[PDB]
Design a protein around this ligand. Structure first.
Ligand code: TZ0
Length: 247
């Protein structure tokens, strides 16, 4: 109830998505993102979870029409950012740094004993200075098989999805498993298949993806390990990295 805000304190300026979400002004002073719920149905979670790489809730209005006020992320979704005009310029150091920020946020989710259940670039927001924050808004291609088949949604299954998100980073937003329909992916991931090394992407990084894609959930690394691994990627793992045409 301390999060409650008067309806007149919000100005909805630019519509962004559609269950809409707007760019707006709160107290005529603050740039904010406003998500609208149409008069379906909440975010007790967002009031507890506070972390540098979790996008923060600012205020709420509880009675229909409901409005969720969160901080503004100037670059939109990471999927849009990677696919858009900035993709051409991102190289591995940039992409690995974003992946470390996401792992960092997810490691906070790991410490809090929460699960995301839907980690992928579409649910990562990007801000100024390549800041990336994980955000909570049929994703078989991103879902760990034991979660997709039996509903075991662990932080372990989120790790599997981080592994897939690393593929989105290194292909600059391309859908994983190119040319495979949903049923084709389920069947082949159980037969042991996994995405190959993306072009120009070091084998050290692809190996990290494979640790994320281990069939045994308890064998995949923690987010604490992933965060640390990516934060020193270019000193401990690829000290010889030389820029390329795309990575
Ligand atoms: C479906 C819309 C969608 O995916 N996007 C991505 C960009 C845009 N969007 N969407 C934003 C959002 C949001 C959001 C709204 C929420 O209300 C529960 C909860 C939540 O968990 C983090 C995130 C957003 C933002 N905060 N700042 C800038 N742009 C934002 C619309």
């Amino acid at each position: 109830d301390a999060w409650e805000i008067p309806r007149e304190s919000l100005r909805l300026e630019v519509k962004l998505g559609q269950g809409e979400v707007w760019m707006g002004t709160w107290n005529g002073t603050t740039r904010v993102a406003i998500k609208t719920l149409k008069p379906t149905m909440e975010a007790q979670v967002m009031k507890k979870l506070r972390h540098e790489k979790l996008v923060q809730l600012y205020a709420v209005v509880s009675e229909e029409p409901i409005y969720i006020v969160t901080e503004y992320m100037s670059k939109g979704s990471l999927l849009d950012f990677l696919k858009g005009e900035m993709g051409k310029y991102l190289r591995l150091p940039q992409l690995v740094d974003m992946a470390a920020q996401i792992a960092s946020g997810m490691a906070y989710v790991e410490r809090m004993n929460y699960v995301h259940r839907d980690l992928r670039a579409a649910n990562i927001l990007v801000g100024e200075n390549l800041v990336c924050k994980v955000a909570d808004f049929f994703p078989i291609k991103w879902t760990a098989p034991e979660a997709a088949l039996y509903g075991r949604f662990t932080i372990k299954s989120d790790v599997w999805s981080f592994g897939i998100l690393l593929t989105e980073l290194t292909t600059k937003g391309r859908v994983p498993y190119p040319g495979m329909v949903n049923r084709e992916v389920l069947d082949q991931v159980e037969r042991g298949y996994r995405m190959p090394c993306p072009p120009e992407c070091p084998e050290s990084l692809h190996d990290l993806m494979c640790q994320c894609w281990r069939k045994d959930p308890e064998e995949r690394p923690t987010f604490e390990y992933l965060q640390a691994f990516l934060e020193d990627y270019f000193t401990s793992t690829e000290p010889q990295y030389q820029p390329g045409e795309n990575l």
